[PDB]
Design a protein around this motif. Structure first.
Motif, mmCIF file in Angstrom:
data_model
loop_
_atom_site.group_PDB
_atom_site.id
_atom_site.type_symbol
_atom_site.label_atom_id
_atom_site.label_comp_id
_atom_site.label_asym_id
_atom_site.label_seq_id
_atom_site.Cartn_x
_atom_site.Cartn_y
_atom_site.Cartn_z
ATOM 1 N N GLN A 107 0.802 -1.212 0.000
ATOM 2 C CA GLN A 107 0.000 0.000 0.000
ATOM 3 C C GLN A 107 0.849 1.282 0.000
ATOM 4 O O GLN A 107 1.268 1.761 1.062
ATOM 5 C CB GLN A 107 -0.952 -0.030 1.209
ATOM 6 N N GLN A 108 1.108 1.847 -1.177
ATOM 7 C CA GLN A 108 1.861 3.100 -1.234
ATOM 8 C C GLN A 108 0.953 4.249 -0.845
ATOM 9 O O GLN A 108 0.419 4.955 -1.697
ATOM 10 C CB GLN A 108 2.510 3.410 -2.608
ATOM 11 N N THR A 109 0.730 4.395 0.422
ATOM 12 C CA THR A 109 -0.141 5.414 0.900
ATOM 13 C C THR A 109 0.626 6.694 1.157
ATOM 14 O O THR A 109 0.108 7.784 0.948
ATOM 15 C CB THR A 109 -0.952 4.967 2.160
ATOM 16 N N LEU A 110 1.894 6.558 1.503
ATOM 17 C CA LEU A 110 2.730 7.700 1.857
ATOM 18 C C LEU A 110 3.314 8.375 0.613
ATOM 19 O O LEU A 110 4.216 9.218 0.696
ATOM 20 C CB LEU A 110 3.824 7.257 2.835
ATOM 21 N N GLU A 111 2.782 8.010 -0.525
ATOM 22 C CA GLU A 111 3.138 8.596 -1.775
ATOM 23 C C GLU A 111 1.870 8.856 -2.551
ATOM 24 O O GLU A 111 1.287 7.928 -3.130
ATOM 25 C CB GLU A 111 4.050 7.681 -2.587
ATOM 26 N N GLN A 112 1.408 10.066 -2.514
ATOM 27 C CA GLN A 112 0.237 10.440 -3.265
ATOM 28 C C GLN A 112 0.484 11.675 -4.115
ATOM 29 O O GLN A 112 -0.455 12.316 -4.595
ATOM 30 C CB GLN A 112 -1.042 10.511 -2.385
ATOM 31 N N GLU A 113 1.767 11.993 -4.297
ATOM 32 C CA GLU A 113 2.192 13.046 -5.200
ATOM 33 C C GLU A 113 1.779 12.669 -6.606
ATOM 34 O O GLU A 113 0.772 13.186 -7.103
ATOM 35 C CB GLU A 113 3.719 13.246 -5.157
#
Length: 113
Positions: A107-113
């Motif tokens: 879950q790439q949640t800490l990347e929403q750029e």
């Protein structure tokens, strides 16, 4: 990941075997049929439990000279009767899986750029 297709050789007693199977799986594709006749139980009375060969988490992928892939439970029960007293099966268990990515997933949640 992979299914561990490992050779399983049991030696039955005068009793015979000491296991059971269950028809699990889904996908009666008609000419593929991704079903799994997994071991339902492995009864202490029989050789399978005392040997430790066919375990309750194992799957009959193929017998000595007959590929299962995913048959009906009756078929699997019958193949063990058509075969000799000692046959090597290829059990394919899906051992790995809980390796990583469980519960929280990646879950790439800490990347929403």
């Amino acid at each position: 990941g992979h299914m561990e297709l490992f050779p399983v050789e049991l030696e039955k007693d005068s009793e015979g075997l000491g296991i059971s199977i269950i028809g699990m799986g889904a996908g009666a594709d008609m000419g593929l049929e991704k079903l799994g006749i997994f071991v339902k139980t492995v009864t202490e009375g029989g050789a399978a439990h005392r040997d430790g060969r066919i375990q309750v988490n194992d799957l009959l992928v193929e017998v000595d000279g007959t590929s299962l892939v995913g048959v009906t439970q009756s078929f699997a029960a019958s193949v063990l009767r058509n075969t000799k007293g000692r046959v090597r099966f290829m059990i394919g268990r899906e051992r790995p899986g809980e390796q990583s990515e469980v519960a929280q997933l990646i879950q790439q949640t800490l990347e929403q750029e």
